[PDB]
C-alpha cells in the first residue's frame, strides 16, 4: 500500500470500498451504472462481447 | 421558435436554438450575473485557474496516503487557499478539490466584499461607486472592480477621506468635523 | 488593529461552528479507516452513502494544547500584568507584589481612575499575554481573576486561605530563577482547561537543576499552590516552604475578555442546585 | 437541618505532611509539569511523481 | 432577611444553611447581621420579591 | 407456566424492595413467593402497594399470570405472576373495602 | 464541622441506596427473564 501508485492506487482502493458496502448494502444504490446512450452502450457491448 | 405541434416535436426532438450542451447550463453568463462582472473573459480565467488547483489535488490524492511529500504539500496548498480567502475551511481537502469554485473567487472580487461589509447596499451599487471612484483600499484607491481583495486586505478597504459619501454618513450619525474636511 | 480583532475573532466562532458540525464526519472516517486495514462490511449508511467513500482519498490522506494557546505556547514567553482592584489597601498591595514575584515576566500595575476598556486596550496594543486582578475584604484577599488577552478566555478564582510572605518571618527574599511546576489531581477536562490556562501563565522552559518549585494541588475542587525550594541530599530531599499559601476555588471561567461581561460562559458554579454537594468539578 | 454548601477546607498539620509527602515523592521521582519549548531513495516512479507534482505546484503558486 | 431568629449567636448557630421561599426559589443564609439583632443576608437564586415568605425545614 | 394450574398457590416468603424511595414503583409492588408444589421460590407482583399494605408474610397467597399487553417505561420485564387471592380473601376486595382479611 | 459531617454521611447514604436497588433489578431481570424465555422457547415448540 506504501509503494503502490496512480490508477492503479485509485482503482485498488476503489474495488476494497465496492467490496465491503456490496456485503452490507442494497444492490441498487450500492451498483448503479454511469449514464450512456441507448446505441453508445449497446455497441459498447457487443464489441466487448465479440 | 413556434412551438411545434406534435409530430413536428417526435421529429424534431434534439433541437434547441437557445441552449445548447458546450453552453454548459449557461453556468458563466449565470455567475457572471450573481455577482455582476463585466466581461466573459474574466469567468474563464478564474475557471482556468480552478482547474490548475484541481488537477494538482488530483495528482496530490494519487500520491500514497501516508507520503510526507503528500501531506507537505496539500498543507501548503489549503492554507495558501484559506489566506488568499477562496475556502473557507482549512482542514478538509476534499474540500480542496470539492469546494474550489469560480464563485468563490468570484466573491473574494472586490465589490462582493464592500456590499458584505455593507459600504454598498447592491453590488450593482458597488460597481458604480468604485467606477466613480470613492473606494480605497489601504491609502491608495482602486479604480478595477476586479480587484481581489484577501482576508487582511479586507481589514483596509475604506472610503475615500474626501467623499461625499463618508460626508453624508458622518452627517447623518451627527459628527461631521470640518477641521479634516471630512 | 480593533478591525483585525473583530474579523479574526468572527472567524474562529465560524471555524469552531464548522468543526463541531464535522465531528460526525470524522467519526465515519474513522469506521471506513478501521474496515478498510481489518475487512470488515461497512454499515448501511456508509455503504449506501456515495459522497464520502467518494471523497475517501482526500480524507484517507488526512491524520493536545488547547485553541487560545496553540499558536505562541512554547514561542513567546508570557508577559503579565498584577493590577489591583480600585483603590487599594495596603495589604492588599502587598498581595499584589506578592503575586508579581512568584510569576516571572510580570509587572506590576497600581489601578486608579483606570478603566477597564482603557486598560485592556492598551494591554492589546502594547502586548501583554495576560492580566490578574486582585479583589480584598479589608485587608484578607478573597479573588483573583486571570485572563488571556487576544480575545482568550478568563477564569475567575476566589482565594480564601491566605498567609503571607512578609507575614511569617525575615527570612530573606525570594529566588526569582524561572521555576518548576507540579499539577496534581488536574484529571477531567475542566481540569486540563485549568492547568493549561495556569500553564501558559508560566514561563517556559525551566532547567533540569533550579531549585524553586510551584504546586497546584487539587484537593476536593479546592487549589492550593505553595513555593518550596528544594536541596538534594544523600539520602532524601529537604525542602523549605516559601511564598504564600492559600487555596483557590474557581468558580467561573467566561470566553471573552474580563472587560467584555456577555461573554460565552463556558461554566459556572452552580450552588442552589439540588445536587450541589454531591460531585467533585461541578 | 440540612447544609447546601461544604463549608472550606481548615488547613491541618496532616494535610500540610500529606502535601510534603506527595511534593517529596514527585521530586525524587523528579516527574514535574512544565511548559517546554516547540523546537525547529524513495523509488524511480515516486521521484517521477514527486518531480511533475512539484514542478506544477510551482507554476500554480 | 428580619424574622426569623432573635440573635446573631443563634444566626451562627444556623449559618450556611438552605431556605427556600414559598414561591419556590432556592438559596441559603449566609452571615449574620449586626447593627439589627435576629436580622441575616441570605443569597437566592433568582430576585426574591418583598410579597413573598422564606422558610427553613427543621426536624 | 407453572406446570398445570392456571392459579397456583404458594407462602410469601419476603418483600422485595420494601426500602426503594419513591412510592408505587415495580421493585416496590414486587414480592417473593415460593410456590408449595415444588418447594420453589419465585418473584411476583402484586397490584397496588396499598395492597402491599395488606400482604404480609407466611400467608398463603394464589398467583396467576400476569400477561403485559404492550411495555411500559419502568416496569420490570421478568415478573410473570401477580397476586390474586391473599389467605383465601382476594385482594380487589380488601382493597375496595368489601372484606376483611381472616388470619 | 457539623455541616461537613453531615453532608459526607448523607451522600455515603445515597451512594449504596443506588447501588443496592440497581443490584436487585438486575437479579430480578436476569434470573426472572432467564425462566421466562425458557418457558416461551419451550411453548413456541408446541
Not at chain 2, 468570484?106 to 466613480?132: G, N, S, W, Y
Not at chain 3, 482526500?58 to 505556547?73: C, P
Not at chain 4, 505532611?17 to 512544565?34: A, G, H, K, T
Not at chain 6, 421460590?41 to 398463603?60: I, M, Q, R, S, Y
Amino acid at each position: 500500500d506504501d509503494q503502490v501508485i496512480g490508477k492503479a492506487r485509485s482503482r485498488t482502493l476503489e474495488m476494497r470500498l465496492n467490496r465491503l458496502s456490496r456485503v452490507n448494502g442494497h444492490q441498487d444504490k450500492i451498483n448503479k451504472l454511469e449514464k450512456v446512450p441507448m446505441h453508445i452502450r449497446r455497441g459498447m457491448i457487443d464489441k466487448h462481447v465479440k | 421558435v413556434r412551438k411545434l405541434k406534435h409530430h413536428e416535436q417526435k421529429l424534431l426532438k434534439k433541437v434547441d436554438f437557445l441552449e445548447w450542451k458546450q453552453d454548459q447550463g449557461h453556468r458563466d453568463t449565470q455567475v457572471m450575473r450573481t455577482y455582476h462582472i463585466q466581461n466573459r473573459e474574466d469567468y474563464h480565467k478564474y475557471n482556468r485557474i480552478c482547474g490548475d488547483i484541481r488537477r494538482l489535488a488530483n495528482k496530490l490524492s494519487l500520491l500514497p496516503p501516508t507520503d510526507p511529500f503528500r501531506r507537505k504539500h496539500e498543507q501548503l496548498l489549503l492554507d495558501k487557499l484559506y489566506a488568499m480567502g477562496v475556502l473557507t475551511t482549512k482542514s478538509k481537502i476534499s474540500d480542496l478539490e470539492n469546494k474550489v469554485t469560480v464563485s468563490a473567487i468570484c466573491r473574494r472580487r472586490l465589490p462582493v466584499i464592500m456590499h458584505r461589509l455593507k459600504m454598498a447596499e447592491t453590488i450593482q451599487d458597488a460597481v458604480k461607486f468604485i467606477e466613480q471612484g470613492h473606494v480605497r483600499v489601504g491609502p491608495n484607491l482602486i479604480n478595477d472592480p476586479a480587484y481581489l481583495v484577501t482576508r487582511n486586505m479586507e481589514d483596509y478597504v475604506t472610503w475615500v477621506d474626501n467623499s461625499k459619501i463618508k460626508k453624508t454618513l458622518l452627517r447623518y450619525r451627527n459628527q461631521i468635523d470640518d477641521f479634516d474636511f471630512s | 488593529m480593533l478591525r483585525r480583532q473583530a474579523r479574526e475573532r468572527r472567524e474562529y466562532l465560524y471555524r469552531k461552528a464548522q468543526e463541531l458540525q464535522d465531528s460526525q464526519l470524522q467519526q465515519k472516517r474513522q469506521i471506513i479507516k478501521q474496515a478498510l486495514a481489518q475487512g470488515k462490511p461497512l454499515p448501511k449508511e456508509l455503504a449506501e452513502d456515495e459522497s464520502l467513500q467518494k471523497d475517501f482519498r482526500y480524507d484517507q490522506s488526512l491524520k493536545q494544547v488547547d485553541d487560545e494557546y496553540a499558536a505562541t505556547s512554547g514561542i513567546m514567553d508570557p508577559r503579565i500584568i498584577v493590577t489591583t482592584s480600585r483603590d487599594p489597601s495596603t495589604r492588599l498591595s502587598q498581595f499584589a507584589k506578592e503575586i508579581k514575584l512568584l510569576f516571572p515576566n510580570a509587572v506590576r500595575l497600581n489601578r486608579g481612575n483606570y478603566v477597564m476598556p482603557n486598560l485592556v486596550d492598551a494591554c492589546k496594543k502594547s502586548g501583554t499575554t495576560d492580566l490578574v486582578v486582585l479583589h480584598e475584604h479589608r485587608g484578607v484577599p478573597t479573588s483573583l481573576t486571570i485572563s488571556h488577552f487576544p480575545h482568550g478566555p478568563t477564569a475567575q478564582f476566589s482565594l480564601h486561605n491566605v498567609v503571607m510572605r512578609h507575614d511569617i518571618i525575615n527570612a530573606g527574599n525570594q529566588s526569582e530563577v524561572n521555576p518548576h511546576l507540579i499539577f496534581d489531581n488536574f484529571t477531567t477536562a475542566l481540569g486540563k482547561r485549568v492547568v493549561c490556562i495556569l500553564k501558559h501563565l508560566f514561563n517556559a522552559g525551566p532547567k533540569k537543576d533550579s531549585e524553586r518549585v510551584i504546586t497546584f494541588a487539587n484537593r476536593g475542587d479546592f487549589i492550593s499552590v505553595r513555593q518550596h525550594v528544594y536541596v538534594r541530599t544523600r539520602e532524601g530531599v529537604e525542602i523549605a516552604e516559601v511564598g504564600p499559601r492559600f487555596e483557590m476555588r474557581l468558580f467561573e471561567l467566561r470566553l471573552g475578555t474580563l472587560e467584555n461581561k456577555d461573554a460565552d460562559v463556558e461554566w459556572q458554579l452552580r450552588r442552589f442546585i439540588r445536587t450541589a454537594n454531591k460531585k467533585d468539578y461541578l | 437541618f440540612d447544609r447546601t454548601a461544604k463549608p472550606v477546607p481548615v488547613i491541618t498539620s496532616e494535610v500540610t505532611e500529606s502535601l510534603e509527602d506527595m511534593i517529596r515523592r514527585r521530586i525524587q521521582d523528579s516527574n514535574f509539569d512544565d511548559l517546554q519549548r516547540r523546537t525547529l531513495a524513495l523509488s524511480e516512479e515516486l521521484q517521477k511523481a514527486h518531480s511533475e507534482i512539484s514542478e506544477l505546484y510551482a507554476n500554480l503558486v | 432577611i428580619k424574622d426569623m431568629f432573635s440573635s446573631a449567636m443563634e444566626v451562627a448557630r444556623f449559618e450556611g444553611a438552605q431556605i427556600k421561599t414559598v414561591s419556590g426559589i432556592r438559596g441559603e443564609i449566609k452571615r449574620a447581621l449586626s447593627k439589627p439583632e435576629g436580622h441575616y443576608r441570605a443569597a437566592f437564586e433568582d430576585k426574591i420579591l418583598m410579597s413573598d415568605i422564606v422558610i427553613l425545614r427543621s426536624w | 407456566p407453572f406446570g398445570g394450574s392456571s392459579h397456583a398457590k404458594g407462602i410469601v416468603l419476603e418483600k422485595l424492595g420494601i426500602e426503594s424511595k419513591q412510592p408505587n414503583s415495580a421493585i416496590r409492588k414486587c414480592v417473593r413467593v415460593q410456590l408449595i408444589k415444588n418447594g420453589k421460590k419465585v418473584t411476583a407482583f402484586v397490584p397496588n402497594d396499598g395492597c402491599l399494605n395488606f400482604v404480609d408474610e407466611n400467608d398463603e397467597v394464589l398467583l396467576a399470570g400476569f400477561g403485559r399487553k404492550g411495555k411500559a417505561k419502568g416496569d420490570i420485564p421478568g415478573v410473570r405472576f401477580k397476586v390474586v387471592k391473599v389467605s383465601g380473601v382476594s385482594l380487589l376486595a380488601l382493597w375496595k373495602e368489601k372484606k376483611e382479611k381472616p388470619r | 464541622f457539623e455541616a461537613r459531617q453531615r453532608i459526607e454521611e448523607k451522600n455515603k447514604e445515597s451512594s449504596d441506596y443506588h447501588a443496592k436497588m440497581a443490584h436487585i433489578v438486575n437479579t430480578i431481570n436476569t434470573e426472572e427473564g432467564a425462566e421466562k424465555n425458557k418457558y416461551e422457547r419451550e411453548r413456541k415448540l408446541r
